[PDB]
Amino acid sequence: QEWSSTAITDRPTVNMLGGYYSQQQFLRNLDVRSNMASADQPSVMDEAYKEFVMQLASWDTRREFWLQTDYYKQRMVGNSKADAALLDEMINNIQFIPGDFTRAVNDSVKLIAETAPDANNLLRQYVAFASQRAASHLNDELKGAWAARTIQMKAQ
Amino acid sequence: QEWSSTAITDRPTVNMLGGYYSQQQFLRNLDVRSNMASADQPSVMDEAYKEF
Amino acid sequence: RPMLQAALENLQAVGPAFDLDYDQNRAMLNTLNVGPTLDPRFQTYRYLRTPE
Amino acid sequence: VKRQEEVAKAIYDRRMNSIEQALKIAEQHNISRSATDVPAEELPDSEMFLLG
């Protein structure tokens, strides 16, 4: 049947970043009064969006998403070879197209399914799935830099 | 038979660099106080990935 | 002789002298010891065309 | 603002302690004259004993 769906995304806002925005700002300011660092750096919203795009187009993210989607578990024959062949085909059903900033084109993602209600229901869950992984990755980065700065200050 | 497989990699993060990240940063500060170094030096993770 | 002995006693009971820069670092170090606050489930994107 | 408030208190507490210790020594050695004409506002925390 091969029904389709589409979505387009852009950078988040300061309001939707929650309390992560303030703490990231605090650490950057330490790096500019001391350490003689910092430059015309990209904003906090820019680096957060860059992480999200990486997870969206990752081959590992698509494989993980299908393994718990309850739409693929029903189409499980039971043979190991058949299941692996089916899973590979469904991974290729998600396509990511990077955008061009000079032509005013944004990033888009497209999904293909077997039924019209399934086409948009699955696409909504996938975008939420990829966003949660990026949020968790950013928290670990903040923790790592926070502990490194404490060690440096404690010694000085 | 000639089967095949593929992998794709990217630069690491601060977390898995371990204790090497802090020690490398300490030496760079003394290189800012002496034998002037360029301001737009590549990041620590950038150089580690270049070696890999 | 006597006030010279007094000078030794007074400086002994006071300790090392610290400047302003030392005190500022200690106050900053207290906040860093609290640790960051992590709140998950915050969005990292916004929609320009919702799926339909 | 909170950090600046606790920095000023730490300095104030240190000055209080130094004054008290110098008072005990002065009464023990029985010094009541002003050995130095430098005002107490600009004296190092070591030498308050050079006062009556």
Numbering used by the authors:
A (entry chain E): 53 to 208
B (entry chain B): 53 to 104
C (entry chain E): 261 to 312
D (entry chain D): 209 to 260
Question: Can I see the authors' text?
Answer:
This alternating arrangement and a highly negatively charged binding face create a dynamic environment in which the polysaccharide chain is extended, and suggest a ratchet-type mechanism for polysaccharide elongation.
The ConSurf analysis also revealed an arginine within α7 (R267) that interacts with the downward facing L4 to be highly conserved. Although the change of this amino acid is clearly visible in the cryo-EM density map, replacement had little effect on the overall octameric structure of WzzE or the alternating arrangement of the L4 loops. The R267A variant did, however, have a small, but noticeable 2 Å shift upwards of the entire L4 region suggesting that this conserved residue could somehow help stabilize this otherwise dynamic region of the complex. Although there are only small differences between the native WzzE and both R267 variants, these variants do underscore the nature of the alternating loops in WzzE, as both structures of the mutants were solved independently using reference-free ab-initio starting volumes and clearly display the same pattern of alternating L4 loops in their unsymmetrized C1 maps as the native WzzE.
